Design a protein around this motif. Structure first.
Motif, PDB file in Angstrom:
ATOM      1  N   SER B 132       2.148   1.003  -7.329  1.00 53.42           N
ATOM      2  CA  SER B 132       3.459   0.593  -6.849  1.00 53.42           C
ATOM      3  C   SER B 132       3.385  -0.786  -6.209  1.00 53.42           C
ATOM      4  CB  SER B 132       4.008   1.602  -5.837  1.00 53.42           C
ATOM      5  OG  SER B 132       4.230   2.866  -6.435  1.00 53.42           O
ATOM      6  N   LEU B 133       4.426  -1.584  -6.427  1.00 48.76           N
ATOM      7  CA  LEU B 133       4.613  -2.836  -5.701  1.00 48.76           C
ATOM      8  C   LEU B 133       5.353  -2.500  -4.411  1.00 48.76           C
ATOM      9  CD1 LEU B 133       4.328  -5.927  -5.627  1.00 48.76           C
ATOM     10  CD2 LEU B 133       6.481  -6.069  -6.889  1.00 48.76           C
ATOM     11  N   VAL B 134       4.636  -2.512  -3.289  1.00 51.18           N
ATOM     12  CA  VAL B 134       5.138  -1.952  -2.040  1.00 51.18           C
ATOM     13  C   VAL B 134       5.404  -3.007  -0.982  1.00 51.18           C
ATOM     14  CG1 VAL B 134       4.074   0.283  -2.461  1.00 51.18           C
ATOM     15  CG2 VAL B 134       2.813  -1.485  -1.225  1.00 51.18           C
ATOM     16  N   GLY B 135       5.139  -4.275  -1.262  1.00 52.58           N
ATOM     17  CA  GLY B 135       5.377  -5.301  -0.263  1.00 52.58           C
ATOM     18  C   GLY B 135       4.991  -6.662  -0.792  1.00 52.58           C
ATOM     19  N   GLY B 136       5.364  -7.677  -0.024  1.00 47.02           N
ATOM     20  CA  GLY B 136       5.067  -9.043  -0.408  1.00 47.02           C
ATOM     21  C   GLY B 136       5.514 -10.006   0.667  1.00 47.02           C
TER      22      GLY B 136
END
Lengths: 320, 341
Positions: B132-136
């Motif tokens: 999952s792409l959970v932050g940036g």
């Protein structure tokens, strides 16, 4: 190669027992561990550190912003990684940054387990560099601070900041430009202005983890980009209003100098700068005396800054 | 005159505007282990129930030299896939299952259109990887990045069972090497690519290679091997996995083989994809340097016992992989560790 030999010690000295593509097991005390992660950059403070030729604490700023965001939800910082991007690799500059990162990891209790140095010649001019930070924390699932316990009548406790930390330095550089003063020469309460401005971000990891173990914390706000107005509502349930007692503390003098030299208005100071408050803690009123006593005796500047009240106002933060 | 952050400032709201636009694309990558955080201070992800003694495997990366060529040709819809692919393909080398991903996006002035296309590529790579792409983070540093330049860095976290960490100790004399075909140069060897393009005076957009412009071959997104490799570990005793990145055959293959072991590569077992034949001719590159700079069509190499080769090849080819027997392992009597024949 000249860099990896000068920084292999920092990876070794920050190593936790859990450390074994870096390998890190989970701390044994967690039954239902939940991973908390975050990434950051230092920001425009990099440019001020470049103009001043002072890179010794930029790495502390990088770690602090990461780990302070993790501990907001009750997470224990576990390991840290950084991505050092530059044009031509200045080994002495990168070594100073990594030393600061190591200092931040040691204060945070997490290990520097990995990193990378990339050279993009056509994209960075001069000796410019950009460093990305990455940190992973562990929290017990039942112990997550989700902010759902923030209720009417909670008291707000503030933790003092070491300075502007790592937000608002775009405005700092503009204020310095229009004032034309030399930050190394302009003395301010016995110290040069540059020391006030370049002071590394305070790391609240150990003090907050000690606090959560002893008192019932409802929520914590890390005051970063957007100051009070942007960061306090992130921890507020619907139909609540945070009322800040402006008289409960005096700004550190660096913020007075910034306001006067830039003619910065009241609302803009509390948006761009932390104005002396690094974190704000929400907790029930019977817990305040225990919380303040613990924090002030264990290396923090803590005071009652405000209260939470039930309110349908669209203005979620009031500073009076 | 009252100074505000609008006299300069990073424009935090532009970064908040970016999160507002791509919120749906990022949500689509969400795993069941992902939990909603408080106010975005940190991303919450539980550990998968599978693991009794979970060990976290982490890494950071950038696309670097390929980013330069991707923007020089003004095509940036797949460089986000490359950023994820480099991370997640490294995680599975030690047997780690990719869990979540974060990105650091830095530029002068935020082009929300260009950023959203990069983030969408990162999210696409996360979908293929099962993480999952959970932050940036989006950083706006106008003085440091000139023109339309931007820099992106990836961070990944994978999980592996402690007793199942692949460290190459199970490699034995007689292990057969299976290769997984690559989609192209992936993300390494691109300073040589740019040099070959210059010295040959080649515009890769108006240069056709087998009906397609050369830019499509050079900028093909890195193939993600996560799901095929994880299944392989599940159904086959995997002894080692080589991820052919910087350094090609000579550097990456010995990095996973134990001491006193040698990889013998049968070069007749495959033909270089035509993009590598083009780079070899246009640059007059020695074949030994080709194996040093480029993967030459081999993205990964798996070491495993000889009896399990047929099942492994059947599993891998069923997932759409280009799999073949590329060589064997034998005891290196104080010899070279990689030999190409």
């Amino acid at each position: 190669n000249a860099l990896v030999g000068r920084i292999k010690g920092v990876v070794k000295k920050t190593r936790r027992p859990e450390v074994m593509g870096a390998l890190c097991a989970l701390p044994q005390k967690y039954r239902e561990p939940v991973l908390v992660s975050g990434t950051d950059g230092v920001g425009t403070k990099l440019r001020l550190a470049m103009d001043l030729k002072r890179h010794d604490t930029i790495g502390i700023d990088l770690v602090a912003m990461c780990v302070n965001d993790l501990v907001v939800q009750g997470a224990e910082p576990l390991f840290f990684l950084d991505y050092y991007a530059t044009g031509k690799l200045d080994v002495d500059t990168a070594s100073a940054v990594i030393s600061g990162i190591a200092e931040g990891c040691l204060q945070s209790g997490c290990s520097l387990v990995g990193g990378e140095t990339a050279e993009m010649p056509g994209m960075y001019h001069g000796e410019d560099y950009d460093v990305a930070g990455f940190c992973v924390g562990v929290v017990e699932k039942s112990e997550i601070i989700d902010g759902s316990k923030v209720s009417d009548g909670d008291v707000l406790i503030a933790l003092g900041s070491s300075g502007p930390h790592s937000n608002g330095y775009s405005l700092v550089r503009k204020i310095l430009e229009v004032s034309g003063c030399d930050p190394q020469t302009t003395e301010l309460d016995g110290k040069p202005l540059a020391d006030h401005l370049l002071a590394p971000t305070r790391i609240y990891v150990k003090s907050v983890l000690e606090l959560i173990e002893k008192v019932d914390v409802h929520a914590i706000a890390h005051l970063t980009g957007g100051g009070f107005w942007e960061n306090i509502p992130r921890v507020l349930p619907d139909n609540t209003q945070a009322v800040i007692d402006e008289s409960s503390w005096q700004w550190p003098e660096v913020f007075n100098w910034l306001q006067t030299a830039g003619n910065v208005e009241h609302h803009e100071m509390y948006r761009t700068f932390n104005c002396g408050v690094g974190m704000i803690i929400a907790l029930p009123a019977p817990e305040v005396d225990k919380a303040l006593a613990l924090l002030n005796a264990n290396g923090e500047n803590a005071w009652k800054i405000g209260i939470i009240k039930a309110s349908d106002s669209e203005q979620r933060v009031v500073i009076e």
